[PDB]
Amino acid sequence: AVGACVLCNSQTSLRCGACIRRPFLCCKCCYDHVISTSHKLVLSVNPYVCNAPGCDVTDVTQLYLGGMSYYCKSHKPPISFPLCANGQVFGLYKVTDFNAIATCDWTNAGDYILANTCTERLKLFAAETLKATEETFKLSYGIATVREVLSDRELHLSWEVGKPRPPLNRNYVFTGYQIGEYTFEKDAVVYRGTTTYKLNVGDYFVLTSHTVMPLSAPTLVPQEHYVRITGLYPTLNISDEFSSNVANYQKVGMQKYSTLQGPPGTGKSHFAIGLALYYPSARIVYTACSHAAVDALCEKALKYLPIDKCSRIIPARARVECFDKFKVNSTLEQYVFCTVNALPETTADIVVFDEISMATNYDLSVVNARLRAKHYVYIGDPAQLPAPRTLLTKGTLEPEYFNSVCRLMKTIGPDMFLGTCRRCPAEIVDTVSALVYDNKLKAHKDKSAQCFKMFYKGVITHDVSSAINRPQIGVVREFLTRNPAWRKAVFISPYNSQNAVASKILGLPTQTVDSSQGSEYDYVIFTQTTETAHSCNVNRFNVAITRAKVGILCIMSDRDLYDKLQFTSLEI
Numbered sequence: 001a002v003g004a005c006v007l008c009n010s011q012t013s014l015r016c017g018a019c020i021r022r023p024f025l026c027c028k029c030c031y032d033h034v035i036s037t038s039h040k041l042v043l044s045v046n047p048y049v050c051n052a053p054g055c056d057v058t059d060v061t062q063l064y065l066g067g068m069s070y071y072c073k074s075h076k077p078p079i080s081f082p083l084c085a086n087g088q089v090f091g092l093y094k095v096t097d098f099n100a101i102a103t104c105d106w107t108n109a110g111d112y113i114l115a116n117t118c119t120e121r122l123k124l125f126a127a128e129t130l131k132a133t134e135e136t137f138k139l140s141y142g143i144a145t146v147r148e149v150l151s152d153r154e155l156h157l158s159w160e161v162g163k164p165r166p167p168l169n170r171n172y173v174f175t176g177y178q179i180g181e182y183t184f185e186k187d188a189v190v191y192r193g194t195t196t197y198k199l200n201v202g203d204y205f206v207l208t209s210h211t212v213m214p215l216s217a218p219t220l221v222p223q224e225h226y227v228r229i230t231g232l233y234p235t236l237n238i239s240d241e242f243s244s245n246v247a248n249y250q251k252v253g254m255q256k257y258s259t260l261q262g263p264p265g266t267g268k269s270h271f272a273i274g275l276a277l278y279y280p281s282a283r284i285v286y287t288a289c290s291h292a293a294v295d296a297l298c299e300k301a302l303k304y305l306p307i308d309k310c311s312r313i314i315p316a317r318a319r320v321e322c323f324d325k326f327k328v329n330s331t332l333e334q335y336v337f338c339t340v341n342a343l344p345e346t347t348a349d350i351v352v353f354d355e356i357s358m359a360t361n362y363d364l365s366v367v368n369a370r371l372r373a374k375h376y377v378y379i380g381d382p383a384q385l386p387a388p389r390t391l392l393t394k395g396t397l398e399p400e401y402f403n404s405v406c407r408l409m410k411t412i413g414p415d416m417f418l419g420t421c422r423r424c425p426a427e428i429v430d431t432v433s434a435l436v437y438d439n440k441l442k443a444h445k446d447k448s449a450q451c452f453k454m455f456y457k458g459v460i461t462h463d464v465s466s467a468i469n470r471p472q473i474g475v476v477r478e479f480l481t482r483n484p485a486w487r488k489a490v491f492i493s494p495y496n497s498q499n500a501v502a503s504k505i506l507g508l509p510t511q512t513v514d515s516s517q518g519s520e521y522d523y524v525i526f527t528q529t530t531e532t533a534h535s536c537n538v539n540r541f542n543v544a545i546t547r548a549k550v551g552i553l554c555i556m557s558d559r560d561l562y563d564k565l566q567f568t569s570l571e572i
């Protein structure tokens with residue numbers, strides 16, 4: 001218990017006992033904390049509790065130092081000094097924002113705003129506190145037990161009484177009982193196990209509540225600007241394919257860390273892999289939160305980088321399927337592709353962190369703790385989707401508050417901006433450029449004349465809280481009969497329940513906006529489903545319409561976003 005203060009680093013024996021993370025607080029900061037919050041328990045080698053037998057006084061403001069022990073007002077000896085006096089709490093080696101982070105329930109957007117506008121040490125305290133809160137909230141949910149096994153992909157569940165039921169979607173991953181991780185989609189429910197096991201009745205599922213480790217490293221290391229490219233050796237012979245990013249790869253070698261805002265289809269993966277061709281002797285660790293984002297970088301590296309110097313790090317507890325073409329778990333390879341949670345303790349000449357809007361400050365800090373690099377490159381787009389904040393239910397989380405990297409890209413601007421979209425028909429590029437990019441995203445493709453929009457509110461039904469709009473799926477069914485080229489389209493919507501109904505009626509492959517991020521399809525059929533803050537979110541709208549290479553059909557509920565779509569309007 002000899003540590004450093006989380007607000008001014010002043011060494012102390014004091015730790016707040018009411019805080020879920022028990023931060024070390026100095027004599028002056030422990031006081032401003034206990035005097036302005038319900039948090040009154042103070043800890044050291046021994047807690048600040050009354051030493052008199054059977055006495056339950058633990059409030060530090062009601063306690064005194066009786067020589068070597070602590071006593072309340074009713075038990076203190078004549079020669080006793082209060083623990084709280086002169087703006088200090090008695091201890092060895094003798095903040096409004098710290099109080100709000102220590103006592104908030106993380107259900108409001110203002111909680112996340114603060115966790116990102118506060119000092120660096122408070123961002124790590126905020127990130128452990130939030131993650132610990134999120135993990136103890138997983139215990140609140142009830143146990144699901146297999147009642148009847150219908151087939152190899154359908155079952156019927158029996159839920160625990162008294163405890164709420166967690167939302168049935170791919171967002172929530174259960175642990176079977178240790179028969180492997182499992183997931184469900186909606187009394188006919190679909191069951192998907194990470195490990196193929198002959199489903200037994202009586203075997204139950206519980207959400208994987210993992211221990212929240214403390215954070216040591218900052219979210220962002222302190223910025224360093226250099227006059228020359230440092231520790232990296234460029235090629236003079238640089239492939240014409242990657243010539244557009246040569247000035248940007250040099251900016252990467254002349255700064256400790258750099259930010260790259262890359263709208264959809266502007267060449268983020270190409271920039272990331274081309275940085276390896278530009279610094280060809282440099283050891284690069286490629287990281288992202290999801291296995292899908294690490295795999296998309298693995299796909300781009302298979303096409304340009306030597307496959308024998310590549311390695312895909314897969315955690316021993318292999319959850320879902322991964323990239324198979326690289327030698328697995330060879331930590332020492334020049335190119336290592338790995339998710340943030342599976343990152344080994346290693347060093348690199350460059351660390352590339354992709355899909356930065358999906359990172360949390362907890363993820364940012366983990367990467368700085370496991371990887372010691374000469375250069376760090378953060379690639380993503382703050383106009384794309386952030387990580388789901390399971391506790392947040394009141395207020396909207398704006399892009400400048402997703403993480404430190406996004407906060408920077410939205411305030412001081414990004415260091416590098418990929419300004420030309422090569423994926424989308426110009427109708428889509430023109431819509432999202434005006435919507436989220438201040439008219440600075442340019443269209444490489446021409447207008448495809450295959451981008452359509454329909455204003456159809458339909459009928460909104462609900463499977464618990466996940467929404468369905470059957471008349472919107474019916475309008476799509478009518479459209480498909482008249483436009484059979486759209487047979488190979490991917491169906492996208494903001495709700496998995498709309499996607500389950502569209503899968504059975506249309507037969508199209510189905511994807512939620514959130515799971516479609518970073519993917520591209522020739523044709524996209526999007527039904528807005530509802531007029532909610534979730535379905536009207538401009539970042540989600542931006543991701544939804546930028547998945548299409550050739551054509552898109554948008555069946556809209558919101559007049560604002562429908563009027564903003566620079567598409568050909570249809571009728572029926």
Ligand SMILES: CCOC(=O)CN1CCS(=O)(=O)CC1
Binds near residue numbers: 261413436
């Ligand atoms: C030369 C400086 O360029 C930028 O900062 C790029 N900026 C364009 C408008 S945006 O897409 O809204 C935010 C990114």
Ligand SMILES: [Zn+2]
Binds near residue numbers: 005027
């Ligand atoms: Zn302090």
Ligand SMILES: [Zn+2]
Binds near residue numbers: 016017019039102
């Ligand atoms: Zn506290």
Ligand SMILES: [Zn+2]
Binds near residue numbers: 050052056071075
């Ligand atoms: Zn007492």
